Symmetry: C3
Subunit: 501 residues, 3 copies
């Protein structure tokens, strides 16, 4: 037994149960255990039972046994023989610890898994040898399917910047081996004696949100804020669904090359604005409660209430008849309340609304709640953006896309009587353009003058021009798109020449 | 004789004179005759003499003889021998019928023709064998030159959707074999016992309009409404000239694939509007009389007076000095009369006008006479379109093409005193913008204020912007055109790869 | 001696000293001398000493000796032998004439030169044989480096349109062999007995301005009026620096193919306007004096004072903080004075200004001093152009390039209080829009109303639209540029096919 232990070749781990060889070969080992433990406990409590564990690359089966010691089933895998023998023997020493173990190569043992066979897999300082053998492209799929078959995988990756030969083969950033998955958070990081460049400790999943505290599953997930949002935020923002919750996860740091100052800073700013607003807000609304908020080294995480109903942008996208009025009424009521307080929401656009059987329209993305000044992103000085939004709301007119979306400002196309409402607001001087005014005008809009008549001169002229402008922008988009497509195809051909040479 | 008749191989036709073999082999034969007869009679009366006839593919010379029986010269052609022998004999039975006949292959007998040798050619159930032998591309030229050498050709084409082997070679639409010619109308159609898919009966010409009643020659013809109109109407609209008449011919149905609902419907709507207007119109104009109107299954035909003078668009296109004023005066006078009645013409554009030695401008295309509402196609609410038109009229400024033509709205560039006229109209509220007002202002425009002075602010600003806008549209057109050209060239290259593979 | 002279083969020149062979072989020779002399004298006086001379291709050393006779050092070069022998002997006849001479081929004798070894080189009827041997591409460099190593080169070129065989090899325009250099002026031209097509006489330099009278060196030189001016003037306009002077040189005639009527005429018009203005101008400014003005057959030359300080466009281009106000004050003061006189400057744009420690802004390019009417090139009726210019002045906003530069018209973005100044001007009717008004408003602008408040309606709307417009133009520029680049690359490929065939 003792003899078989030394027969062992390179004691990477601590042998579990006796401390006599802790002095000889090793790495720290015991700390990593502590964090994994924390994670296990939190996870298990959250679903409501003990868990199945996969110690992919276990060596001396240290981690397995230490987990099995707390009511866990482990099937530890280390392809080389001696490491397994001794750890299976270590398994027998403490009979109550349900751990199986076997010799075999991880790649194929992963292949042979089930959608929910295991709840947890461990990949501590193991894959860097695999990727050296196979390649980045290969390994990525293993891990991706590993997240799919389990429910949460924790890994410790060796970075390319290490002395050992294999280093050169692995990716400059170990984060490249995980990105393909849904959730990933930096739960830890450890320094190596090899070089002053430490190896990180990541946490993944393809079914659940795995925060410090909030460990709940999601239904669907993505990478963009809304339908037709694009690349606007450099693939950095992540959005997770949930039956009763919704999650935001912005990264402050990205693989390879980077979110420039402004982007990183702004999504940092955005979150910190949101959390500081949602906790301690004004009076007179039905705003969602903070379900979970928190920050990490490179990553900033937020979770809130999955408030009811669904988005307008997608409604208009289809055409589900929405009562034009009701949404506006509620929005204005709250909006007024806000204008009163001294706050403001700059992005008054149709991608920020909710609808139910009462159509009580409430906003989303409270990171746009700008306190001090009106401004928006485009139509300067709010009220105009609101006009656009109103045109965007009514709509039923072609499909205009000007980068700086979309519909005409001004009511004249708007049917009667809103037509009139807005012309009345319009007449007035800009200094009086506060939302308090609008709502009031909004309310007694039925008694307002004919609008469409008092126009003539200018005001007709510009209607004709506003329609011309969107068509122009609208086309520029398409020919610009043709141009961008060729820019993309031209890169390929430049590369191709080198391949052909 | 009788013996030679049966010696004959396959009695496709009825032998002419005796009814004894009408029972044996056949196709109906006698009906087709009746329609051809009608057509001959109408044609002959219209020019004022009997006619030369070409029975291309005659078989038993039935049709020839039946035509020769009414004072016609026929040179019937059937390449195979037996069919000719018997029909020449049938020719001799009735000596007074001037018909020659000979054995030879149609293709070469067509080649040997003269510009006005024949007045009529018959191609009843014959070419489908030719196109099987040669091909669609080939046959098209035969027919095209056949229309050129004669004066009217009637054909009966076998459609590709027929059981017989040759079917597969012919075009899915038999209308593809004729389109290259000037005039074509569906004069009939016949069902075949082969399959429940009938073979049509078309009527062509490259010199004359061949209506039911109106059978008059034209000088020149085309496919587009005006110089620089484009593909806007899917090659469906045809326009025929004439020394004293003008013709319109819109198709409700096209070869291969199709005028979508809107296009078919709109050109149907356009005609039906025109005929319903020109007959029973308002008071106070010099409008043209209906020379001929009528409808067919797939085709809608209209003919009216070739009213005098010539178009303005082409005048401006060159530069023939037109008295700026006179045209406007008359146009307004009638226009006013119309506004008064309750009617309206929406397309107040320079492609719709006439000019003589008195410049009494009158419109064209009475399918744009929209009764109820002002609107136009672009510059909304007429009066503005009129402004554009006035700028379009004066002009002498570069060459602006914005899709939504072209010139600035507003008079400020317009020289004095119209400058003033329009600023005065402009000042006024839009609700008062009726043509009745304009004419009156038009008349006393000499006594109007300085216009160009009272501007300042806005009104200058927008002048500068209006000039910018056309330049922008104007360029977008060209780079858009470059883009469309590459889209066209790219298709070719995609195809090319398949050819090269 | 006399015997050696006839031993000579072809007496192209006159033998210097005796007139006995002037009758036999020759070309005129003596006239060319007279012009070269003039040039030498003027040059020498201007630097303040006698000069070193290179008689590249000298034949009978006539010109050399004639120059050496006036205190010049000559190293005459004629590759063929006999011509040198006799001219070295002619050199010895008049011992006081410092001339060396040697046999060798010009190309290599040029190679062996120094930056300031010689002050003058002569290339009279010599290179056409070289270019026949080598080629246009080759010869151009010889001459280019010849201008660099000397300080002024005069040449007489044989044009391609000559009977002699070599003609076919030389360029259709002999001006093609010089253009690469900095300065070139047509100082003369001579008819040849060969054909009624004369050979010209050009004067070059790469260090100095070589006018009739003004023979001063420059520091730097170019081809475009300012940073980012482009090809706008067909490579015809040349601009020469100087420690105390500045030079303009516009060509009325260009190599190959040509400055069309308008371009030639306009740069002729531009100069003649300038000289007629700068001499006999209005009162109330600090305008520069004419240092030298004059005209030539194909070339129009002007030189004026290098007035102090530097350009604004390049200041803004970098960002050297300029006192927003001071420049405006002075400009307006003079501008007012001008408006008063009855004159005007149409191109009120930031590429036409100067700055010092007092920022007393004064204009440049007095060829834009249009007397009678306001107009500019774009923003019609001056005052608006001034608005643009003011926006262009303040700036600090992105980088807008609309062809018709650039910034918004109108003050509303302009900070306070100019904001107000311009709204006040704006309010007023256009007929009152003279600069006299503006300055006065400019002065008491501190006491003006709030501007930014009284807006509302329209005036806000158009602010939003003005920003949209520049972005649109701004993009059109880039995609237009992509398009133009492909137009350029496509030409190459069309050519390539012919090369590949
Ligand atoms: C360095 S250890 C770390 C073990 C454990 N994850 C830890 O951190 O305590 C990695 C172990 O996995 C094994 N291993 C490496 N590549 C493997 C593969 N493709 N399949 C199975 N085991 C592998 C090695 O034998 C080695 O003992
Ligand atoms: C089916 S028939 C119809 C005859 C006649 N057009 C009618 O409908 O009563 C066609 C006849 O034209 C002849 N034919 C076919 N191809 C021909 C060609 N290329 N040249 C001359 N005759 C041809 C055939 O022999 C056949 O008898
Ligand atoms: C026609 S002459 C003119 C001489 C002198 N430039 C003049 O105009 O009085 C040109 C002379 O230069 C010589 N020459 C031609 N090509 C030359 C070369 N590549 N190098 C040196 N000398 C050359 C010829 O021998 C000839 O005598």
């Amino acid at each position: 037994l003792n003899t078989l232990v030394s027969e062992l070749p390179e004691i990477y781990q601590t042998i579990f149960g006796h401390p006599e060889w802790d002095g000889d070969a090793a790495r720290d080992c015991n700390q990593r255990l502590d964090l994994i433990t924390e994670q296990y406990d939190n996870l298990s409590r959250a679903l409501g039972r003990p868990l199945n564990v996969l110690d992919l690359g276990c060596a001396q089966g240290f981690f397995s046994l230490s987990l099995a010691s707390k009511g866990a089933t482990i099937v530890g895998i280390d392809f080389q023989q001696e490491n397994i023998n001794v750890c299976r023997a270590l398994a027998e020493e403490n009979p109550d610890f349900a751990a199986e173990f076997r010799v075999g190569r991880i790649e194929e043992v992963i292949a042979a898994l089930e959608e929910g066979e295991f709840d947890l897999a461990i990949g501590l300082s193991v894959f860097h040898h695999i990727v050296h053998l196979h390649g980045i492209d290969e390994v990525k799929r293993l891990l991706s399917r590993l997240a799919d078959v389990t429910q949460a995988v924790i890994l410790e990756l060796a970075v390319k910047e290490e002395p050992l030969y294999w280093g050169v083969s692995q990716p400059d950033d170990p984060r490249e081996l995980i990105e393909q998955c849904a959730f990933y958070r930096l739960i830890g990081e450890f320094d190596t004696h090899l070089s002053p460049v430490p190896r990180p400790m990541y946490l993944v999943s393809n079914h659940r949100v795995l925060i410090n505290d909030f460990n709940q599953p999601f239904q669907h997930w993505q990478n963009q804020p809304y339908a037709g949002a694009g690349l606007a935020h450099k693939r950095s923002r992540r959005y997770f669904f949930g039956e009763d919750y919704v999650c935001k996860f912005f990264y402050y740091d990205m693989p390879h090359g980077i979110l420039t100052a402004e982007e990183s800073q702004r999504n940092k700013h955005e979150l910190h604005n949101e959390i500081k607003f949602l906790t301690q807000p004004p009076a007179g609304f039905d705003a969602p409660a903070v379900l979970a908020h928190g920050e990490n080294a490179q990553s900033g995480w937020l979770v809130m209430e999955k408030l009811p109903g669904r988005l307008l942008s997608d409604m208009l996208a289809a055409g589900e008849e929405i009562d034009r009025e009701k949404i506006l009424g509620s929005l204005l009521r709250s909006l007024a309340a806000l204008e009163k307080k001294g706050f403001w929401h700059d992005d008054v656009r149709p991608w920020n609304v909710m609808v139910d059987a009462r159509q009580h329209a409430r906003l989303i993305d409270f990171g746009s709640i700008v306190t001090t000044p009106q401004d928006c992103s485009w139509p300067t000085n709010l009220v105009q953006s609101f006009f656009v939004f109103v045109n965007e709301l009514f709509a039923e007119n072609k499909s205009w896309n000007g980068f700086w979306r979309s519909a005409p400002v001004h009511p004249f196309n708007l049917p009667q009587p809103w037509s009139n409402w807005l012309y009345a607001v319009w007449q007035e001087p800009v200094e009086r353009w506060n939302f308090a005014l609008l709502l009031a005008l909004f309310e007694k809009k039925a008694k307002l003058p004919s609008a469409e008549q008092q126009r003539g001169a200018t005001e007709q002229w510009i209607i004709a021009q506003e329609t011309v402008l969107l068509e122009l922008q609208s086309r520029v988009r398409n020919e610009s798109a043709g141009s961008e497509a060729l820019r993309g195809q031209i890169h390929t051909l430049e590369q191709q020449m080198a391949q052909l040479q």
